[PDB]
Amino acid sequence: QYVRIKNWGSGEILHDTLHHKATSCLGSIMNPKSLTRGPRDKPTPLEELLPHAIEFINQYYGSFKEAKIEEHLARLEAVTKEIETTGTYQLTLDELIFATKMAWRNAPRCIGRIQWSNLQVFDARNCSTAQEMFQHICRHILYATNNGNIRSAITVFPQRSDGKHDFRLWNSQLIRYAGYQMPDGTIRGDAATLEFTQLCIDLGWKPRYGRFDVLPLVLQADGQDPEVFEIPPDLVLEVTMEHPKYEWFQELGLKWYALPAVANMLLEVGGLEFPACPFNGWYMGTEIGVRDFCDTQRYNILEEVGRRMGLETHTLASLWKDRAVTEINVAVLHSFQKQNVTIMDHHTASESFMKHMQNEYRARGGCPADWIWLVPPVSGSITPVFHQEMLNYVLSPFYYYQIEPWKTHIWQN
Amino acid sequence: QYVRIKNWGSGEILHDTLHHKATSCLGSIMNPKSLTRGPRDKPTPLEELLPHAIEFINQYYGSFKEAKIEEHLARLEAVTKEIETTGTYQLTLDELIFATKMAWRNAPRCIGRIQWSNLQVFDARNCSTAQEMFQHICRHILYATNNGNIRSAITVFPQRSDGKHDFRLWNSQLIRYAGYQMPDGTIRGDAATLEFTQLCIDLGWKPRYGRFDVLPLVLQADGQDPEVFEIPPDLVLEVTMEHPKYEWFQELGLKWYALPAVANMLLEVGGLEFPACPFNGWYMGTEIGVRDFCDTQRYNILEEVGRRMGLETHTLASLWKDRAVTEINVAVLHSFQKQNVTIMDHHTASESFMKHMQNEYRARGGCPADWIWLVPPVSGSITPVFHQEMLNYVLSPFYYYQIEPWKTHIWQN
Ligand code: HEM
Ligand code: HEM
Ligand SMILES: C[C@H](O)[C@H](O)[C@H]1CNc2nc(N)[nH]c(=O)c2N1
Ligand SMILES: C[C@H](O)[C@H](O)[C@H]1CNc2nc(N)[nH]c(=O)c2N1
Ligand SMILES: CCCc1cc(C)cc(N)n1
Ligand SMILES: CCCc1cc(C)cc(N)n1
């Protein structure tokens, strides 16, 4: 049958049948095992790889408007033989392109999925060295950035073979700031990247002890020890934070990178695994203004901006935190828009996702969604998405989390 | 063992062992069967009632600091015999008081649980007629209201016997406004109570076609047809909405009842079920300002307040919805505080719940929590609760939802 889903805002009902294809209640758990695809030391068993491969080949060929059975049956034949003769198989570029968009399409934590069909794919499956990973990463950052007119892209490195030759990016994001535990008890920069910053120092990276120090790319190639590479500052576009009214906002000396790029996820498709496949899209205002700037475990600027606004920062009931965070979000949006850097505010994003959800239900009878992540960190019920009942499930292709590399890596030297 | 829970704000770790006592992923489903205890036509089977009764008696007696084994063993004896001789059993007043607070304690959707130990219990288990239910309900509303100094209370009516004599309140809340489908296409009042308002009209209630018409109590006594009773206006305390700066706010002619009282839930305890046990606490600002006033399926005042604030109400990116909703929340809080009606803002509530959670983990190794409901409808990440990982589970005693009565009732006449 199906599962009835209701939108309490519009009163609309949808019928979810897509969940039938997935694979006590841990609700708000950030990194659950169900969303994580770990390491291996031995190749994927053939009895598992084959049915998974076949299923993907059928999905891929079954995605065209006008079916191409001749080519479909031929691919099934060749794939089976390649697995038989080599122990694994290589996807064609079109299958990879299809796989990367589908995985994005299947990302339950992404509110920007209406753009799923627009994705640039850089094939780095022939990559061999750390230096080469680095060159691809630079080409990626440069293409995606496009001088502010952000373009969604993904770079695919070699697939996992036996699990002892994994290509991995130790960074959580391509571009991110360093976090320092200054002497005076106060953390400087981005407190989220504290443990990682130290790791970069252990590998010889030169600390510049600032609030916005762009960290280096830490690349692991073919299972070998990671190599440190600084990102050419020319490639890192940034936005100066300016409020369109409180001229004292600049006096805060705030800024943020224009490129949100995930660096540590794993792409699973047709039984294959890609431990390294960095991808980016464009920012949604609240990520920066609310999470990056106001989380107490991040920049924690909230009170400083409060005091500055001349608000009762000692009486919670005054709703000062509410007033401040809104101006910061206004600052962020204002700044990006002025400096011509692509950005989407949370209200527009939500409406866009609601539209995407409607489309997906008619198109394939469902849309895997994680309410907890899809609802903006501010203006909850003020957004459409808040009133939309959702079903969270893992399909395939899919983007999985991975165990942090420093926790499983065997240091050669 | 246990489940590790992490607060990403403070970095604190907690160990949940309490879940061991409970009983694809439907995350954002509002009324799931797991939270609903439906009707019956036959009495609870003895093989089920007894172990459930015994478990509760053991929990109750095992709750005291200094154990009272003599009385504990005697109660087990008497309970067993009462079930043997009568087919069911009556809780003592102390057990009921304990049960109602524990059920509240176990309510995963309640952010106000730090107050669990402060609950007035009105024993109406001897109630017989609709008129009597009504008198108890009036006594409740009056006690709880206390001229604005709100007091948490619950009234327990007779327990379900065979399921064909259920005491039920057809209302969702004790005090609520009517919703009318005016001629000109526009809904008037509270659109949420549309279907119910009609039901009240079918039962003879006199429509007053206003925006704030307090609906009547629809009481079902001893399984019989429901009787309509208007609530004495003297008992219904209200708050006039006034902004401390935008004097034009009053020109909106808004107000809200000071008493949030759930009327349709079922209390389950020791194998017994109470289909009628209305309860109240005090309001949290956002319930009114954000949900009641701004939900499009409710009052939907957002744009009108936007225009009035002289904001760009046609450009989402301007974040006008953000600016407006904050003033409304300021209005609500301001008004209640002035007219001396108890109220809690969402930031204070969240901090209070976080404190309660800490206490509960040390006290009993867990706190059943539903993130989706505990995180305020605005200022999501700005609150502590947003960064707290939570585990949602059903314990016992517990407050369950029930199937709407008009859907299962057999109309005698
Ligand atoms: C085109 C613009 C896009 C927008 C506006 C967008 C927006 C978002 C937002 C707001 C989040 C949550 C951020 C957080 O709280 O960490 C997110 C997460 C995610 N998005 Fe998108 N995204 C876009 C493109 C993409 C692309 C191109 C991919 C993949 C190819 C993608 C994959 C995902 C995944 C897997 C997550 C989850 C990351 C995690 O769990 O930490 N997104 N996206
Ligand atoms: C003392 C003050 C209290 C506060 C501030 C408080 C606050 C809240 C809030 C904000 C909600 C969610 C409202 C909604 O979105 O519908 C709620 C739900 C709930 N609360 Fe409390 N509450 C209080 C007392 C109580 C008491 C005395 C009980 C029970 C004896 C209780 C039982 C629950 C239950 C069962 C729900 C869920 C109702 C539903 O699922 O629709 N609360 N409470
Ligand atoms: C504990 C909770 O899961 C965590 O704080 C969340 C919740 N929702 C989120 N939503 C988004 N989009 N991004 C996040 O990082 C989080 N974190
Ligand atoms: C679909 C979703 O479950 C629904 O809109 C929610 C979510 N969170 C909520 N949270 C609270 N406190 N109250 C609610 O009514 C809801 N409704
Ligand atoms: C890097 C932070 C998380 C993220 C990822 C993507 C793809 C888009 C986006 N806007 N944010
Ligand atoms: C009646 C609306 C829901 C509710 C219930 C309780 C007990 C408290 C509260 N503040 N809100």
Short mmCIF file of all heavy atoms in Angstrom, two decimals, chain B residues 71-103:
data_model
loop_
_atom_site.label_atom_id
_atom_site.label_comp_id
_atom_site.label_asym_id
_atom_site.label_seq_id
_atom_site.Cartn_x
_atom_site.Cartn_y
_atom_site.Cartn_z
N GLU B 71 3.55 -2.21 53.99
CA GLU B 71 2.42 -1.64 53.25
C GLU B 71 2.49 -2.04 51.78
O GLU B 71 1.46 -2.23 51.13
CB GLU B 71 2.43 -0.12 53.40
CG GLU B 71 2.28 0.34 54.84
CD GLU B 71 2.63 1.80 55.06
OE1 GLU B 71 2.88 2.53 54.07
OE2 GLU B 71 2.67 2.23 56.23
N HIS B 72 3.71 -2.17 51.27
CA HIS B 72 3.96 -2.55 49.88
C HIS B 72 3.41 -3.94 49.61
O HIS B 72 2.66 -4.15 48.65
CB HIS B 72 5.47 -2.50 49.60
CG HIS B 72 5.84 -2.86 48.20
ND1 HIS B 72 7.14 -2.76 47.73
CD2 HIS B 72 5.11 -3.35 47.17
CE1 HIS B 72 7.18 -3.16 46.47
NE2 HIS B 72 5.97 -3.53 46.11
N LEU B 73 3.79 -4.89 50.45
CA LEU B 73 3.35 -6.28 50.32
C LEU B 73 1.84 -6.41 50.55
O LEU B 73 1.19 -7.24 49.93
CB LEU B 73 4.12 -7.19 51.29
CG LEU B 73 5.44 -7.80 50.78
CD1 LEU B 73 5.16 -8.80 49.66
CD2 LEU B 73 6.38 -6.71 50.29
N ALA B 74 1.30 -5.57 51.41
CA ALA B 74 -0.13 -5.60 51.70
C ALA B 74 -0.94 -5.12 50.50
O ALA B 74 -2.01 -5.67 50.20
CB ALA B 74 -0.44 -4.73 52.92
N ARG B 75 -0.42 -4.10 49.82
CA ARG B 75 -1.07 -3.52 48.65
C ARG B 75 -1.08 -4.51 47.51
O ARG B 75 -2.08 -4.64 46.82
CB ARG B 75 -0.38 -2.22 48.23
CG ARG B 75 -1.11 -1.46 47.13
CD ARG B 75 -2.49 -0.97 47.58
NE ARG B 75 -3.15 -0.22 46.50
CZ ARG B 75 -4.45 -0.29 46.22
NH1 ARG B 75 -5.26 -1.06 46.93
NH2 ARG B 75 -4.93 0.38 45.18
N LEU B 76 0.04 -5.21 47.33
CA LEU B 76 0.14 -6.22 46.28
C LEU B 76 -0.95 -7.27 46.50
O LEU B 76 -1.68 -7.63 45.58
CB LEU B 76 1.53 -6.86 46.27
CG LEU B 76 2.65 -5.97 45.72
CD1 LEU B 76 4.00 -6.56 46.06
CD2 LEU B 76 2.50 -5.80 44.22
N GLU B 77 -1.10 -7.67 47.76
CA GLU B 77 -2.09 -8.66 48.19
C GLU B 77 -3.52 -8.20 47.87
O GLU B 77 -4.26 -8.90 47.19
CB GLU B 77 -1.95 -8.87 49.71
CG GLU B 77 -2.58 -10.14 50.28
CD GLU B 77 -4.07 -10.02 50.59
OE1 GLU B 77 -4.53 -8.93 51.01
OE2 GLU B 77 -4.78 -11.04 50.44
N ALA B 78 -3.88 -7.01 48.36
CA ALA B 78 -5.21 -6.43 48.16
C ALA B 78 -5.56 -6.16 46.70
O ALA B 78 -6.70 -6.35 46.28
CB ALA B 78 -5.35 -5.16 48.98
N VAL B 79 -4.57 -5.69 45.93
CA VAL B 79 -4.75 -5.38 44.51
C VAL B 79 -5.07 -6.66 43.76
O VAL B 79 -6.05 -6.73 43.01
CB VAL B 79 -3.50 -4.70 43.91
CG1 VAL B 79 -3.57 -4.68 42.39
CG2 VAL B 79 -3.39 -3.29 44.44
N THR B 80 -4.28 -7.70 44.01
CA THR B 80 -4.48 -9.00 43.38
C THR B 80 -5.89 -9.52 43.68
O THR B 80 -6.60 -9.95 42.77
CB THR B 80 -3.44 -10.01 43.87
OG1 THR B 80 -2.13 -9.56 43.49
CG2 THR B 80 -3.69 -11.38 43.27
N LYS B 81 -6.31 -9.43 44.94
CA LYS B 81 -7.62 -9.90 45.35
C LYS B 81 -8.76 -9.09 44.79
O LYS B 81 -9.82 -9.63 44.48
CB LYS B 81 -7.73 -9.99 46.87
CG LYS B 81 -7.39 -11.38 47.43
CD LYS B 81 -5.93 -11.79 47.17
CE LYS B 81 -5.65 -13.24 47.57
NZ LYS B 81 -4.25 -13.67 47.22
N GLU B 82 -8.54 -7.78 44.66
CA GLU B 82 -9.56 -6.89 44.13
C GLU B 82 -9.78 -7.20 42.65
O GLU B 82 -10.91 -7.23 42.17
CB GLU B 82 -9.17 -5.43 44.33
CG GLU B 82 -10.30 -4.45 44.09
CD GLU B 82 -9.97 -3.04 44.54
OE1 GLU B 82 -9.15 -2.87 45.46
OE2 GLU B 82 -10.55 -2.10 43.97
N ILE B 83 -8.68 -7.47 41.93
CA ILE B 83 -8.74 -7.81 40.52
C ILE B 83 -9.45 -9.17 40.40
O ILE B 83 -10.31 -9.36 39.54
CB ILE B 83 -7.32 -7.85 39.88
CG1 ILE B 83 -6.75 -6.44 39.81
CG2 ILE B 83 -7.36 -8.48 38.49
CD1 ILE B 83 -5.31 -6.37 39.36
N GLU B 84 -9.11 -10.09 41.30
CA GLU B 84 -9.72 -11.41 41.31
C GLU B 84 -11.22 -11.36 41.58
O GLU B 84 -12.00 -11.99 40.86
CB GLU B 84 -9.06 -12.31 42.36
CG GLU B 84 -7.69 -12.83 41.92
CD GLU B 84 -7.11 -13.86 42.89
OE1 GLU B 84 -7.68 -14.05 44.00
OE2 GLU B 84 -6.08 -14.48 42.52
N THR B 85 -11.61 -10.58 42.58
CA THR B 85 -13.02 -10.45 42.94
C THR B 85 -13.86 -9.45 42.14
O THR B 85 -15.07 -9.62 42.06
CB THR B 85 -13.18 -10.10 44.41
OG1 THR B 85 -12.30 -9.01 44.74
CG2 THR B 85 -12.86 -11.29 45.28
N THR B 86 -13.24 -8.43 41.54
CA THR B 86 -14.02 -7.44 40.79
C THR B 86 -13.70 -7.28 39.30
O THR B 86 -14.44 -6.61 38.58
CB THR B 86 -13.94 -6.03 41.43
OG1 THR B 86 -12.64 -5.47 41.18
CG2 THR B 86 -14.18 -6.10 42.94
N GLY B 87 -12.59 -7.85 38.85
CA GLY B 87 -12.22 -7.75 37.45
C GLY B 87 -11.37 -6.54 37.13
O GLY B 87 -10.87 -6.40 36.01
N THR B 88 -11.21 -5.65 38.10
CA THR B 88 -10.40 -4.45 37.94
C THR B 88 -10.00 -3.99 39.33
O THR B 88 -10.22 -4.71 40.30
CB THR B 88 -11.21 -3.33 37.25
OG1 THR B 88 -10.33 -2.24 36.95
CG2 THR B 88 -12.34 -2.84 38.15
N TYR B 89 -9.38 -2.83 39.43
CA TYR B 89 -9.01 -2.31 40.75
C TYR B 89 -9.01 -0.80 40.75
O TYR B 89 -8.90 -0.16 39.70
CB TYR B 89 -7.66 -2.87 41.22
CG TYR B 89 -6.44 -2.26 40.57
CD1 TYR B 89 -5.61 -1.38 41.27
CD2 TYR B 89 -6.09 -2.59 39.26
CE1 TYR B 89 -4.46 -0.85 40.69
CE2 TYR B 89 -4.94 -2.07 38.67
CZ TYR B 89 -4.13 -1.21 39.39
OH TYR B 89 -2.98 -0.73 38.81
N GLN B 90 -9.20 -0.23 41.94
CA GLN B 90 -9.20 1.21 42.16
C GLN B 90 -7.85 1.66 42.74
O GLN B 90 -7.31 1.03 43.66
CB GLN B 90 -10.30 1.60 43.14
CG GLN B 90 -11.70 1.45 42.61
CD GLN B 90 -11.97 2.36 41.43
OE1 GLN B 90 -11.54 3.52 41.41
NE2 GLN B 90 -12.67 1.84 40.43
N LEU B 91 -7.28 2.73 42.18
CA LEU B 91 -6.03 3.25 42.72
C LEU B 91 -6.37 4.05 43.97
O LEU B 91 -7.51 4.48 44.16
CB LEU B 91 -5.35 4.18 41.72
CG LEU B 91 -4.82 3.66 40.39
CD1 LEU B 91 -4.29 4.84 39.60
CD2 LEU B 91 -3.71 2.61 40.58
N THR B 92 -5.41 4.19 44.87
CA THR B 92 -5.63 5.01 46.06
C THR B 92 -5.37 6.43 45.56
O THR B 92 -4.79 6.62 44.48
CB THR B 92 -4.59 4.71 47.18
OG1 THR B 92 -3.29 5.11 46.73
CG2 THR B 92 -4.57 3.24 47.52
N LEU B 93 -5.76 7.43 46.34
CA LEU B 93 -5.52 8.81 45.94
C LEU B 93 -4.03 9.11 45.78
O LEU B 93 -3.63 9.81 44.85
CB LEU B 93 -6.15 9.79 46.93
CG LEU B 93 -5.98 11.27 46.54
CD1 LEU B 93 -6.70 11.53 45.21
CD2 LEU B 93 -6.54 12.15 47.65
N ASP B 94 -3.21 8.57 46.67
CA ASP B 94 -1.77 8.81 46.59
C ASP B 94 -1.15 8.18 45.35
O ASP B 94 -0.25 8.76 44.74
CB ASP B 94 -1.07 8.38 47.87
CG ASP B 94 -1.36 9.33 49.02
OD1 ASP B 94 -0.88 10.49 48.97
OD2 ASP B 94 -2.09 8.96 49.97
N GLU B 95 -1.67 7.03 44.95
CA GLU B 95 -1.18 6.34 43.77
C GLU B 95 -1.60 7.14 42.55
O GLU B 95 -0.84 7.27 41.59
CB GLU B 95 -1.74 4.92 43.69
CG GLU B 95 -1.19 3.97 44.76
CD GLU B 95 -2.00 2.68 44.92
OE1 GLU B 95 -3.11 2.56 44.34
OE2 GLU B 95 -1.51 1.80 45.67
N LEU B 96 -2.81 7.70 42.59
CA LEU B 96 -3.30 8.49 41.46
C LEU B 96 -2.46 9.75 41.29
O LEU B 96 -2.04 10.08 40.17
CB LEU B 96 -4.76 8.86 41.66
CG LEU B 96 -5.37 9.68 40.52
CD1 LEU B 96 -5.39 8.85 39.24
CD2 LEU B 96 -6.78 10.11 40.94
N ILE B 97 -2.22 10.43 42.41
CA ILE B 97 -1.42 11.65 42.43
C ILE B 97 -0.04 11.31 41.86
O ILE B 97 0.46 11.99 40.96
CB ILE B 97 -1.32 12.21 43.88
CG1 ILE B 97 -2.69 12.74 44.33
CG2 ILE B 97 -0.24 13.31 43.98
CD1 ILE B 97 -2.74 13.23 45.77
N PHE B 98 0.52 10.21 42.34
CA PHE B 98 1.82 9.76 41.85
C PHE B 98 1.77 9.46 40.34
O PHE B 98 2.64 9.88 39.58
CB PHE B 98 2.26 8.52 42.63
CG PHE B 98 3.47 7.86 42.07
CD1 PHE B 98 4.74 8.39 42.29
CD2 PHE B 98 3.35 6.70 41.31
CE1 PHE B 98 5.87 7.79 41.77
CE2 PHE B 98 4.48 6.08 40.77
CZ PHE B 98 5.75 6.63 41.00
N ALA B 99 0.71 8.77 39.92
CA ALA B 99 0.52 8.40 38.52
C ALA B 99 0.41 9.59 37.58
O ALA B 99 1.00 9.59 36.50
CB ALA B 99 -0.71 7.52 38.37
N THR B 100 -0.35 10.60 37.99
CA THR B 100 -0.54 11.77 37.14
C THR B 100 0.74 12.59 36.95
O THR B 100 0.99 13.11 35.86
CB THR B 100 -1.69 12.67 37.65
OG1 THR B 100 -1.41 13.11 38.98
CG2 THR B 100 -3.01 11.89 37.62
N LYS B 101 1.55 12.68 38.00
CA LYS B 101 2.81 13.41 37.90
C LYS B 101 3.82 12.61 37.09
O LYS B 101 4.55 13.17 36.26
CB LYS B 101 3.36 13.72 39.29
CG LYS B 101 2.49 14.69 40.06
CD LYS B 101 2.96 14.83 41.48
CE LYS B 101 2.11 15.83 42.23
NZ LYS B 101 2.62 16.04 43.61
N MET B 102 3.86 11.30 37.31
CA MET B 102 4.78 10.45 36.56
C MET B 102 4.45 10.48 35.08
O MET B 102 5.35 10.58 34.25
CB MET B 102 4.76 9.01 37.07
CG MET B 102 5.59 8.79 38.33
SD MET B 102 7.36 9.19 38.15
CE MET B 102 7.76 8.35 36.59
N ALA B 103 3.16 10.42 34.74
CA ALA B 103 2.75 10.45 33.34
C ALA B 103 3.23 11.77 32.71
O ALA B 103 3.72 11.79 31.59
CB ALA B 103 1.24 10.32 33.22
#
